[PDB]
Scaffold this active site. Sequence first.
Site, PDB file in Angstrom:
ATOM      1  N   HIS A   5       0.829  -1.194   0.000  1.00 18.51           N
ATOM      2  CA  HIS A   5       0.000   0.000   0.000  1.00 18.51           C
ATOM      3  C   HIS A   5       0.872   1.256   0.000  1.00 18.51           C
ATOM      4  CE1 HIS A   5      -3.328   2.749   1.089  1.00 18.51           C
ATOM      5  NE2 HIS A   5      -2.549   3.156   2.108  1.00 18.51           N
TER       6      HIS A   5
ATOM      7  N   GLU B 267       2.205   1.989  -3.468  1.00 16.82           N
ATOM      8  CA  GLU B 267       1.194   2.584  -4.331  1.00 16.82           C
ATOM      9  C   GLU B 267       1.196   4.111  -4.198  1.00 16.82           C
ATOM     10  OE1 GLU B 267      -3.182   1.399  -4.199  1.00 16.82           O
ATOM     11  OE2 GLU B 267      -2.981   3.184  -5.426  1.00 16.82           O
ATOM     12  N   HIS B 268       1.345   4.631  -2.966  1.00 14.39           N
ATOM     13  CA  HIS B 268       1.470   6.066  -2.727  1.00 14.39           C
ATOM     14  C   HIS B 268       2.729   6.640  -3.379  1.00 14.39           C
ATOM     15  CE1 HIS B 268      -1.699   6.808   0.463  1.00 14.39           C
ATOM     16  NE2 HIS B 268      -1.760   5.486   0.251  1.00 14.39           N
TER      17      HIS B 268
ATOM     18  N   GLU C 236       4.482  10.872   3.087  1.00 10.31           N
ATOM     19  CA  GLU C 236       3.406   9.908   2.897  1.00 10.31           C
ATOM     20  C   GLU C 236       3.021   9.245   4.208  1.00 10.31           C
ATOM     21  OE1 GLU C 236       1.124   9.621   0.055  1.00 10.31           O
ATOM     22  OE2 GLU C 236       2.448  11.386   0.152  1.00 10.31           O
TER      23      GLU C 236
ATOM     24  N   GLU D 281      -5.311   8.136   6.980  1.00 14.06           N
ATOM     25  CA  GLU D 281      -6.243   7.214   6.335  1.00 14.06           C
ATOM     26  C   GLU D 281      -6.628   6.072   7.273  1.00 14.06           C
ATOM     27  OE1 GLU D 281      -3.830   6.060   3.001  1.00 14.06           O
ATOM     28  OE2 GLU D 281      -4.401   7.841   1.841  1.00 14.06           O
TER      29      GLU D 281
END
Lengths: 55, 402, 438, 63, 124, 124, 273
Positions: free
Chosen positions: C49, C52-53, C122, C129
Amino acid sequence: MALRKKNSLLNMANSYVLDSPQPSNLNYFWNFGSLLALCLVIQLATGITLAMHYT
Amino acid sequence: FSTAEAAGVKVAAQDGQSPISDLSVVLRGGSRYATVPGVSHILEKFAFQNTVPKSALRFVRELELFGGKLYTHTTREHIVLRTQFLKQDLPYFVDAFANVLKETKFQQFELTERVAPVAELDLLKRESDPAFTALEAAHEVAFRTGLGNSVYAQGYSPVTLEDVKEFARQVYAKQNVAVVGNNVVPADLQQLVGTAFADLQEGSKVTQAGTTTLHGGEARVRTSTGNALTIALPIAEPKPVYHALASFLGGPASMPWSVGASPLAQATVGTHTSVKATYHNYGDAGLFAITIKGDSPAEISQVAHKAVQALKDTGAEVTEEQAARAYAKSKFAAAEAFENPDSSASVIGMELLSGVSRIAPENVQKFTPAELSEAAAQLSASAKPVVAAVGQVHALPFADEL
Amino acid sequence: VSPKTRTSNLKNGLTIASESNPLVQTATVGVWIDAGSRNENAYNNGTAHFFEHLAFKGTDKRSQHQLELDIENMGGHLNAYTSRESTVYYAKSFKDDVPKSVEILADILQHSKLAESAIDREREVITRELEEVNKQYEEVVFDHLHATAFMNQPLGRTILGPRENIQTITNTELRKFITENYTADRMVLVGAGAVDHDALVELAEKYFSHLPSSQSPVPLGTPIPNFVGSEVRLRDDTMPVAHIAIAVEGVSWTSEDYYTALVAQAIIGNYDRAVGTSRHQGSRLSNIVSENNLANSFQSFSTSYSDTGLWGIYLTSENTTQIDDLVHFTLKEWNRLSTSVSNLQVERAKSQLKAGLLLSLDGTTYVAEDIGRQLTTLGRRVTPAEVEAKLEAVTEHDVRAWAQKTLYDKDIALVGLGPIEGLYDYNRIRNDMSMMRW
Amino acid sequence: GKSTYKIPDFTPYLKKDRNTDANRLFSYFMIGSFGMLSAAGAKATVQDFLSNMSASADVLAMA
Amino acid sequence: ASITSVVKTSELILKSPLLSKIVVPLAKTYVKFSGYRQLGFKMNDLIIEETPNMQLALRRLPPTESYDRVYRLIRATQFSLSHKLATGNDITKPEEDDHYLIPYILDVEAEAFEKDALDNLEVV
Amino acid sequence: ASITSVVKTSELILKSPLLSKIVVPLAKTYVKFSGYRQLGFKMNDLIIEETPNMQLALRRLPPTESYDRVYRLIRATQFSLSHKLATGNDITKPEEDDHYLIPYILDVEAEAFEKDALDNLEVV
Amino acid sequence: VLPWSIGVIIFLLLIITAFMGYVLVFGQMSLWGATVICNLVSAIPWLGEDIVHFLWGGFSVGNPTLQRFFALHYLMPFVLAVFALLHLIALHTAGSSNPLGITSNVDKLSMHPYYSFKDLITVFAFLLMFTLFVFFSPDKLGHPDNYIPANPMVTPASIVPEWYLLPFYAILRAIPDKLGGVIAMVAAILILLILPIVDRSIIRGNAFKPISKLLFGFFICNFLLLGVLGQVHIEPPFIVLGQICTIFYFSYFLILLPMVSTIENIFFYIGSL
Ligand code: HEM
Ligand code: HEM
Ligand SMILES: CCCCCCCCCCCCO[C@@H]1O[C@H](CO)[C@@H](O[C@H]2O[C@H](CO)[C@@H](O)[C@H](O)[C@H]2O)[C@H](O)[C@H]1O
Ligand SMILES: CCCCCCCCCCCCO[C@@H]1O[C@H](CO)[C@@H](O[C@H]2O[C@H](CO)[C@@H](O)[C@H](O)[C@H]2O)[C@H](O)[C@H]1O
């Protein structure tokens, strides 16, 4: 709706012996109530039978 | 899409190489033509209720046996009723549309128990997004009636069975009906529509009560369910340059976890807000809107000021790079609009009903930096700016602040 | 009849798979990878994940700003998603903007900068999130469902990962993850829409030729999960809607019962009070639920993985005093899959699925997703004819046999969220998985 | 402690073979045995008890 | 028996000339001796209402029909408990004895019966 | 007995130097042998709640205090049914045994008792 | 349906209670009525004889039988009170019906004081009837033979049940077969359970149904005639009469009520068009 909840007669039994909400932490001293029900059922069954033979 | 005519009904079809067909009936019956507020939404929800040949129940049970699906929506211009099915099941779907248009039994109990409750949940789901509300309120301020009528039925204005029956008498008529078939053999559709829709009334073209008038003003909608702000500008002469302008100005990101190089996307920097420039061509009139949603009303206020500045900055001058970006993004937008069946149906529907020949994505005009800057300049210097605040309206900007 | 899916390989072992469509003017091109969060351990959980950022945070050549500009100049959009077993990076562009989008993807995958400063930036985003997923109730329910069903197993871990790992993921761990997992034999370059296959293969030879091959190349879609009957209750009396999921262990992609499980799932089906047609659906559960107002919605699912799956239902309800009825009737309909289903229900569900399986593939993205999914899970695009034959082979006997081994009297995983006081304890729910009358 | 996705430790209680037929069969053997003894005990009880109603020894002596 | 059954059988009889010639006069005398009109009822006021189908049909009545039915039930109940008969305008005239409820219940039952049939469909 | 009574009598004792010197050590030992802290309870969690006054005081608790009380009751119920005692952080430390409820119930009872007095006032 | 169905069981319990109570006197009718009625159980195939000896506690009706009938006679009224309460709890969901057959949800009255005081009127009317029998004619409803002590040797001239069982006895006699007769007699009570099915009317009750009212009148009078035939001697022409009345009793449930209720439905609809 489940029949046990819908039908008024079934719902009364349901309320006492099935869905009845109880505390989760009753210890074995909460078992005497049903033992007393058992003694009562035995006395009715044996007593009515004795009454068939007693004068 | 080969346009033809079958028993007085305009039919457009495009054959393809896929097992799945989409058949749409487009009706000239959207909310601008509504007689009573909300009737076009209620009429849309009344499609595929009980007809004389086939009950709602029987239709749904048979639709499941074909594995078909049903989609309906209402716009300001159209009601669109779409079915998706396997290619070979075409005759069933044509006949079902015919039953709806000729033989709908509009029963009071269907309105009370089925149609109005579904219309009410439809609206509540849309309003969960405060940006939807803001952009709806902006149309109401900008146009008042016609385009300013609500698209959806509301509780405050009850639609009666007599209202819906009257409107359907006008709308469900050969003059207001267009059939659009995606992945349908064009000759086969024409033959079927020609036999099924032959006995539909001719009727007359439904017209907008009154000429489209343009107004300015404010609409503060107090909700407790999130914050949005639309800065709309009603246009009396809808130009295609505003499409390129919206695409240029932008607002959303074109990659994940990013802001975006668009002016409006660079107005949200440092906040948790989202911008969206949207041009709404409506034939006689138009609306250019900048919708900013977000959590914090102060954050929205900040972005709103940057948004208005961005438009002024555009009006000053844009570069060749910016102009090329506008065209590229606008051509892509056109392409995907003509692809998505929801919007495809309405695009050809507008060509068939109204007469506005479709602009192919490959024929999207390239606007020079001069033409883009002139379009933005014409918007920054509008005499009738519309602002619609939704949410904590006391903390959102006013028109005179912007 | 849709056009044939063409498939080619490169020397490294990268598959190229394409399905052309002349009517559209826009084309989806992207990279489907047979890797996801399952490939992490408990110490780097959340790496996939995190990557992906960072994939959209700047490359060896172009900066983040340049990257943004380049995509905007093409006119289309780039998108990515990471699941438990699959990662996807696609680019919807115009017909003529396909080569440039292919170039951008190869760059972000093979040569991303992964700057320390960008990682730190990030970290905060991902941390936010983690305390924002709460809002998405369905996601919360399904993440807890996997966590409990695959207790302490890789399929039971969340994609985002724990807060602790998020604070400790380094560029080293990131680099190691994508070097081990993003290998050519695990990747499929997929084109759908306005693409020429031969053009796509040339672009693959140009951009993806220097991809590492793995040491031991297994076939695409190659995997032991031990399901745990269990429950998670997340009671929240302040929520108005209860969300409940109930699942049993289901079937993998290549199970012989794959289609039988889909047919069984279609017999129960979905329901939503907001859709006008839902009150008229053929499904027995749908009729019970709509007539008695037991729920706002339910959705049957049959989720598959390489070596396991979850089959069950997800319900939402405001009827807090009749949650017991809702669950009771749902499990009584599952019981009928083992005791009562006949040719009637089975043939109806097959009829619905025959269309549904083709209907799903709408736009170019949908087609690309299908090609990519099938290539990474099955190793091939299954033709509609083969799918129609596999569905036709499902009989009522097969459904009953499958239900009797998979549902009847089996342990469930149960998650409830919201006002769930009316949801009974595990035993009473699990007792509804059989019928004393049968 | 905080994350609700980290399931508490159930390893002290979990059986490895929980999904097997053998596992379920064992518990149904216990339930079945209990039902079996309850049926046999009920039958004995009913038979012995209801036999009070059949002719008593003094009645059979005079037959 | 379902209202549907009663209505369909009656329609078979009304079609047959012979049958109608003999049945319609009997039905009219039956209704006169029934005497429900002497308590100010309409025939449909007597239909059993304690079923799901009938409760649905009663909910679909237009509000005015619904309010008037309530009044006729209360008025008949008051005649019953007093052992009186309606007089004057309270007596239901034959022209006032309209089948206000029959169409609603026929629609409810049509759906209910179609649902039962469709629950038993077999793909051929 | 009313919470008011208990609190006032305790305050009389705490005032008297002699009395406090002898009562406070006994009360502290009592609380140690009571052992409610070994189930993670606070003393106020044990107060009988099935009274109008107590139900009112519980409704007035701040939401945070109210949610934490719910958790402590559920946690103690789980220790009780398992025949286990709290360990580690679950044991209530003397510094955590705060009278979170006493002020609310004293206000409820103050009003209730004033109402009773004022219902019996005599104009002089 | 449910209060009615529990009501049918109440009626069966009343019959058993009264049968056992009558035996307790141990006069001639007590003994001989017990003998004949308990021997009906011998008709049960295979096990019937064994069941009778088990009921009697011996090989004929005697002391064991009497002592068990006392214990059961004492018990059965308590069971009957429970079922009476159950049928009222079941009724309480719909409430009482009323003579018009329509809903009363529109117009309700409290049980007290209205029906309390209405019930007192018939309590005193009942007490007046009770007074006239108990104080002035206490043996009118009884059989003189029950003032003779039970004698297993001497058989009374005629063994008949108490009047309230007579119709069921006539139904039993009508069928020549022993087991046939027993089944018919039980069926005559159990058939009440099918009234909810065989009544096809769309309207509740007979207030507005002239033909149903006539049929009901014949059904009632036939049931009284069956009662009278239950205590005549088995002689011509009462034998055939009892068979015709038995057929009519059953045909009310099985044929006439379903036919008449179907036709009246049509008459109401056509008649009011
Ligand atoms: C035939 C005699 C009795 C029977 C069958 C009986 C039965 C029961 C049952 C089944 C319960 C619930 C379960 C339990 O707590 O054990 C109960 C609770 C109770 N019984 Fe009894 N009982 C009887 C006699 C008594 C007597 C003599 C008293 C008091 C002097 C009493 C007072 C109570 C109380 C106060 C409760 C509630 C206890 C609680 O849950 O905290 N009962 N009884
Ligand atoms: C709470 C229920 C009952 C209790 C506590 C109870 C208690 C007793 C006791 C202590 C005796 C003396 C027993 C002996 O030493 O021989 C007895 C005898 C008797 N009981 Fe009960 N009894 C109950 C219910 C009944 C019932 C319902 C009957 C029904 C008639 C009955 C009938 C008899 C008879 C006939 C005897 C005398 C024969 C004998 O001694 O065994 N009992 N009872
Ligand atoms: C051997 C005994 C003879 C038979 C008696 C049967 C058991 C006794 C029942 C009489 C008590 C009925 O009195 C009432 O009944 C209703 C109907 O279930 C029950 O009502 C209870 O359960 C229902 C649903 O199960 C809940 O909606 C309700 O909140 C709760 O009070 C309660 O128990 C009681 O409020
Ligand atoms: C609700 C139940 C409905 C129907 C049930 C029918 C049950 C009634 C039948 C009573 C049967 C008695 O049947 C008879 O019982 C006794 C025990 O009681 C048995 O007697 C046997 O065991 C007993 C002890 O248990 C010994 O004293 C005896 O030496 C031995 O022969 C007989 O072998 C059997 O013939």
